[PDB]
């Protein structure tokens, strides 16, 4: 994350930290005691599929505080349409070997209805993104979960506002822009899958999942976020699905 502030511990209970062989892979959200959404593009170069961990309860990766929970990741499901190496349909559902144990510091994040979110959460200017960015970077707080506050943009104002003669990449119905065009704050490498959490009438819900952009906090540029709303139907389907064998599974879309 860029331009962020550390997230008061337990003020981001649905953030997940995804490892591949003890390594930092990405971030992701916890919707219920067993499922986890995250960006599809993290599992593009995964070879050792048996070694996918998912740490929840984390905050500061430099010290310990009985809150961290590890769980294996049995499945990583993503759009049949998801085409490796592209920007469209950057989402993935994750089935965890054993359910996590909700606690004051581990809490799922309300996923809404394809209606509620399109009529409402859609029209809310400010929402939160969160994550650890690049855990190698040497900065003092480099090891702390950080949250940002970013306003959302109607994809058009985003195509417009974008110093877009600048190789403007397509901006599909399956995405939306968000942030500040001036290059002060934005999500960044290692944040993918993180939740772009929205608050409304008292509860947080999930609208985006950190996807890509054109340079972290680049002037004239915004950060893209996968439009959760669109996948909803597909996510609730796959949660009632008969658990399948292989780790990766390309469910058909829609």
């Amino acid at each position: 994350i860029v331009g962020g502030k550390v997230c008061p511990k337990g003020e981001c209970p649905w953030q997940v930290l995804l490892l591949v062989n003890g390594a930092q892979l990405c971030g992701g959200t916890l919707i219920n005691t067993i499922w986890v959404v995250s960006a599809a593009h993290c599992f593009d170069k995964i070879k050792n599929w048996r070694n996918l961990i998912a740490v929840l309860g984390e905050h500061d990766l430099s010290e310990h505080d009985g809150d961290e929970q590890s769980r294996r990741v049995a499945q990583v499901i993503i759009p049949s349409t998801y085409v490796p190496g592209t920007t469209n349909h950057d989402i993935a559902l994750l089935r965890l070997h054993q359910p996590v144990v909700l606690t004051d510091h581990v809490v799922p994040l309300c996923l809404p209805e394809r209606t509620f979110s399109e009529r409402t959460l859609a029209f809310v200017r400010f929402s939160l993104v969160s994550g650890w960015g690049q855990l190698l970077d040497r900065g003092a707080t480099a090891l702390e979960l950080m949250v940002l506050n970013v306003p959302r943009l109607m994809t058009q104002d985003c195509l417009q506002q974008s110093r877009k003669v600048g190789d403007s990449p397509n901006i599909t119905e399956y995405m939306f822009c968000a942030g500040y065009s001036d290059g002060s704050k934005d999500s960044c490498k290692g944040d993918s899958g993180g939740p772009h959490a929205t608050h409304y009438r008292g509860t947080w819900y999930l609208t985006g999942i950190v996807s890509w952009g054109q340079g972290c906090a680049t002037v004239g540029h915004f950060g893209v976020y996968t439009r959760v709303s669109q996948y909803i139907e597909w996510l609730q389907k796959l949660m009632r699905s008969e658990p399948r064998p292989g780790v990766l599974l390309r469910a058909p879309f829609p």
């Binding site: 490892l19 500061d60 990766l61 310990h64 961290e68």
Partner: peptide, 17 residues
């Protein structure tokens, strides 16, 4: 591998080797 890094909770080592 996160374990490789000295400033990390050593808990992150159970997931390496």
């Amino acid at each position: 591998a996160l374990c490789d890094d000295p400033r990390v909770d050593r808990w992150y080592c159970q997931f390496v080797e």
